[PDB]
Amino acid sequence: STHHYEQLIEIFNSCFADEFNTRLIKGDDEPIYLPADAEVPYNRIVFAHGFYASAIHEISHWCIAQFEDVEVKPQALDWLFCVAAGYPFNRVVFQRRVHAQVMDYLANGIPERPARFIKALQNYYYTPELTAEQFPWPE
Template identity: 30%
Template structure:
């Protein structure tokens, strides 16, 4: 049911004519590459990775969408607590949008700290991070989604026939608060 190739076609149908951007899977590591067309490349064929990378694209403004990987800082797996706190600060908004995308298509959502080899202090941040992401997702709903995330949520809801209407109940239904380790299909 949740096939990443479906997301690629849906993304093209929803955004290509205005933003000249495509969504593609198959990468070992995700990346955004500006060009003709711009490319959002997600990990392998992971559905959640595709949603996560679209969330980053939705957060990035026009200037950042001209930069490789939006000009973001990224440290690989194995971050210490300080690096993990910085990671969490920049990931709250994209993961909140990803949670809303999951709600729109009826897919479970868990935060991803993307740091399986980090130290213990870094791993303890997960519960607090999940709460921040949940609050930010609710704030998006209260304030109203920006145009690109709203268009994507509507496209997902129509494609997956979920009846998503932007209400908090659909978010709360898919948002899983868990300290369990994520599967490789979880996020980035």
């Protein structure tokens, strides 16, 4: 499969534009959240640069909502999303924390919004069910 940020916009919107009135938007240098207003009547998650990985990361942050602690769960969702999409995921100590969080999600449950997005990615890209074996321990 190819991987283009435009695909993530369509997949995200298919998942969330109705139920949560939220859409994904390609921006400039800034990640932004812009609430619905009277002119543009839907919430916007804006990601920086026309870059697949950038869009993934903002979707993860939206799903969740010293810097290391704040970033563990969003980066775990990043990893889950990347594997669900067939996209490569991207020191060692931190990624091992992220790996443990991925295992926590797989073992104990993925929250509703990222779970929905993962299922949609799998149908969009024709990928198999997630297994923990697809997430190698950082070495």
